[PDB]
Amino acid sequence: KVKTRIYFCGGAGFRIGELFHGYHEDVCYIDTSVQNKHKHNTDDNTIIIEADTKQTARKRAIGMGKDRKAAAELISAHIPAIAHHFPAGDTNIVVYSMGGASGSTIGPSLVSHLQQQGEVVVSVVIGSYDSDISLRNSSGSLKTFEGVSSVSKVPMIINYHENVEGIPQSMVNQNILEVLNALVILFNQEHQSLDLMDITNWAHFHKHHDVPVQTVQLHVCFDRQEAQAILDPISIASLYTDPDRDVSISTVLTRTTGYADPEKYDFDQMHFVINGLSIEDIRKRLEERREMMNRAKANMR
Numbered sequence: 001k002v003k004t005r006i007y008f009c010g011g012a013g014f015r016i017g018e019l020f021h022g023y024h025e026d027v028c029y030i031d032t033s034v035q036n037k038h039k040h041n042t043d044d045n046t047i048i049i050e051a052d053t054k055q056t057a058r059k060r061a062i063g064m065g066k067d068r069k070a071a072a073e074l075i076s077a078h079i080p081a082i083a084h085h086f087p088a089g090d091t092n093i094v095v096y097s098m099g100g101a102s103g104s105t106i107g108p109s110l111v112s113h114l115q116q117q118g119e120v121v122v123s124v125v126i127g128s129y130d131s132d133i134s135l136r137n138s139s140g141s142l143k144t145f146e147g148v149s150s151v152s153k154v155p156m157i158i159n160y161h162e163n164v165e166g167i168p169q170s171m172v173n174q175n176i177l178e179v180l181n182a183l184v185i186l187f188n189q190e191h192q193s194l195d196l197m198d199i200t201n202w203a204h205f206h207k208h209h210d211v212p213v214q215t216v217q218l219h220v221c222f223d224r225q226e227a228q229a230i231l232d233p234i235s236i237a238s239l240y241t242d243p244d245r246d247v248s249i250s251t252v253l254t255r256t257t258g259y260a261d262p263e264k265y266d267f268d269q270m271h272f273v274i275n276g277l278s279i280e281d282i283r284k285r286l287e288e289r290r291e292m293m294n295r296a297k298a299n300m301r
């Protein structure tokens with residue numbers, strides 16, 4: 001098994017994968033049309049699941065209407081095939097927008113399948129509210145998250161980014177790139193005192209502490225302060241280049257701790273904090289911000 005397999009799904013996924021090209025080898029792409037393909041998609045790393053046009057309206061409903069029910073109908077028979085062509089790694093990262101129809105159905109469907117096979121999985125996702133469609137789909141995706149946790153009986157881990165009004169998608173994408181780079185490092189199995197089983201136990205915290213299975217949020221923090229401010233942590237993994245200064249025995253006992261080689265890594269410390277996720281809180285925010293946008297009728301010049 002590769003150490004980390006990344007699955008880029010739908011339009012946002014393809015765009016991020018394009019930006020991430022060269023940062024990791026074991027990546028792949030899945031979509032419901034060819035329209036999002038770019039120079040790095042090939043038959044070896046890309047699967048396209050399309051309506052058998054042997055269906056103009058249905059494709060329009062999926063592609064332009066972003067009808068998630070229609071999209072999920074289209075892709076559901078092919079999910080096990082995807083995992084067969086693009087085998088799961090020791091860790092897996094699935095990347096998708098919540099507001100469209102392809103990523104927001106392929107992605108969580110894949111996460112569910114992989115978790116049912118016992119795999120460690122993280123999603124890096126994007127909430128949006130640029131339209132009524134985006135808002136409704138993003139709300140639906142939050143509920144899909146709870147269904148993945150319930151169906152697969154493994155906590156679905158969500159690293160959440162939001163398309164805030166006035167912030168270019170290119171800057172959200174760059175934040176996602178930094179997260180992807182951090183995860184690849186965390187998962188590379190090259191650090192002292194951090195093995196495959198340590199990461200598996202951090203992610204599948206339900207098998208080791210018996211908190212109920214629930215959807216959870218992953219926060220990636222690049223300094224001690226960000227990490228500490230996170231409310232009610234459930235499971236934390238931390239990587240330090242200066243344990244002599246920063247790591248006590250209490251930290252080792254209460255946290256998934258690893259030592260990164262200061263001869264090789266340039267960061268001080270990285271914290272990967274899993275805590276509870278309230279889909280209700282995120283839905284309300286998206287709705288409030290959509291209303292504020294509607295009332296503003298404003299563009300940043």
Ligand SMILES: Nc1nc2c(ncn2[C@@H]2O[C@H](COP(=O)(O)OP(=O)(O)O)[C@@H](O)[C@H]2O)c(=O)[nH]1
Nearest residue numbers: 010011012015097099100101102103128169172
């Ligand atoms: N941050 C970010 N958002 C995106 C990107 N592409 C699309 N979006 C937003 O994601 C939502 C769904 O788009 P998309 O991923 O293309 O839909 P899909 O192909 O059906 O899964 C819309 O709100 C888009 O504005 C991207 O590259 N970066």
